[PDB]
Design a protein around this ligand. Structure first.
Ligand SMILES: Nc1ncnc2c1ncn2[C@@H]1O[C@H](CSCC[C@H](N)C(=O)O)[C@@H](O)[C@H]1O
Ligand SMILES: COC1=CC=C(C(N)=O)CN1C
Length: 256
C-alpha cells in the first residue's frame, strides 16, 4: 500500500490537476464525477443548514474546487494536506499567481448552480479571503494537525482523501476519530469518496486505495462516534484507465 512518503516523492500536483480537474466540454467520466461532487457540495453547504465559523478541509491536495460552495457558509477555512508540493500548488492559486492552475471553468459552473448572484472574479475573491491557514496534516496522527492550535471547528470536510490515506479499516476508523478531535460536539463531518476502489492513477504513477463498500464506510463512521444525517451512493465510475471504483459516496455526519 502506497506509503506516506510515496506521496512526498511521487504525487505530482500539476499532473493530478490536469488528469482529473480540467473540466472540458467533452462529457468524460472525470467531468461527470466532478459535476456530481460540485452539486453535492452546493446542496450540502448552500441548500442545507451546514454553516458556521470554521471549516477544516482534510487532504485538499492541490485542488480548491471542494471549497467553492463552502466559502459562502463558513467565515474561516483552514486547508491541509500531508504533502508540501500540494500545498504549494494550492498557494499558487490562493495568491492568484499567473502560473496557477486554471479553475475558471469550474468556478463558472459553481456560480451557475447558485443562480449567478456572484461573478467568477468575486467567487474567487471570497474563497481567497476565507482561506486563513494552509497546514501540514496527517489523518493517521491522533492530533492530525500536530502542534498547530485551532479552536473547535464547526465542520470537517474530506474529499477523496480517506480511501487514499488509510491502508485498512482499523486505520480508516481511527482517522475518523482523529478527525473528530477537531470538531465541536454536534459538528459536521463531510466525506465524499470512491467506492470499492483499490487504486487510482496519475500519469504513470499508481496509487493504492482502500476498497470499501457503503456498509463498511457507514459502520466505520458510526463506530467513530458520529451520527449519520445522510448518505448517498452513486454508480458513476472513473475511466477504466484511471481508477477501478464501482462508484462514489457522500455523507454528512454529526459528532456526539
Ligand atoms: N496520511 C495522510 N494524512 C493527510 N492527508 C493524506 C495522507 N495520505 C495521503 N493524503 C492526501 O490525500 C490526498 C488525496 S488526492 C485528493 C485531493 C483532493 N481532496 C481532491 O479531491 O482532488 C493527497 O493530496 C494526499 O496528500
Ligand atoms: C481523482 O482523485 C482520486 C480518484 C480516485 C481515488 C480512489 N481512491 O479511487 C482517489 N483519488 C484521490
Amino acid at each position: 500500500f502506497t506509503s506516506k512518503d510515496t506521496y512526498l516523492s511521487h504525487f505530482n500536483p500539476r499532473d493530478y490537476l490536469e488528469k482529473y480537474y480540467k473540466f472540458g466540454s467533452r462529457h468524460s467520466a472525470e467531468s461527470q464525477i466532478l459535476k456530481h461532487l460540485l452539486k453535492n457540495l452546493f446542496k450540502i453547504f448552500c441548500l442545507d443548514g451546514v454553516k458556521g465559523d470554521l471549516l477544516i478541509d482534510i487532504g485538499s491536495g492541490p485542488t480548491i474546487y471542494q471549497l467553492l460552495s463552502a466559502c459562502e457558509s463558513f467565515k474561516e477555512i483552514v486547508v491541509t494536506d500531508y504533502s508540501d508540493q500540494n500545498l504549494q500548488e494550492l498557494e499558487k492559486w490562493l495568491k492568484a499567481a499567473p502560473a496557477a492552475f486554471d479553475w475558471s471553468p469550474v468556478v463558472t459552473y459553481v456560480c451557475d448552480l447558485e443562480g449567478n448572484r456572484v461573478k467568477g472574479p468575486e467567487k474567487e475573491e471570497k474563497l481567497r479571503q476565507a482561506v486563513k491557514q494552509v497546514l501540514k496534516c496527517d489523518v493517521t496522527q491522533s492530533q492530525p494537525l500536530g502542534a498547530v492550535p485551532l479552536p473547535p471547528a464547526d465542520c470537517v470536510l474530506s474529499t477523496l482523501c480517506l480511501d487514499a490515506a488509510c491502508p485498512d479499516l482499523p486505520t480508516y476508523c481511527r482517522a475518523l476519530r482523529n478527525l473528530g478531535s477537531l470538531l465541536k460536539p454536534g459538528g459536521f463531518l463531510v466525506i465524499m469518496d470512491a467506492l470499492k476502489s483499490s487504486y487510482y492513477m496519475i500519469g504513470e504513477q499508481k496509487f493504492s486505495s482502500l476498497p470499501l463498500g457503503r456498509e463498511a464506510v457507514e459502520a466505520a463512521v458510526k463506530e467513530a462516534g458520529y451520527t449519520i444525517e445522510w448518505f448517498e451512493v452513486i454508480s458513476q465510475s472513473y475511466s477504466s484507465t484511471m481508477a477501478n471504483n464501482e462508484g462514489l459516496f457522500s455523507l454528512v455526519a454529526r459528532k456526539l
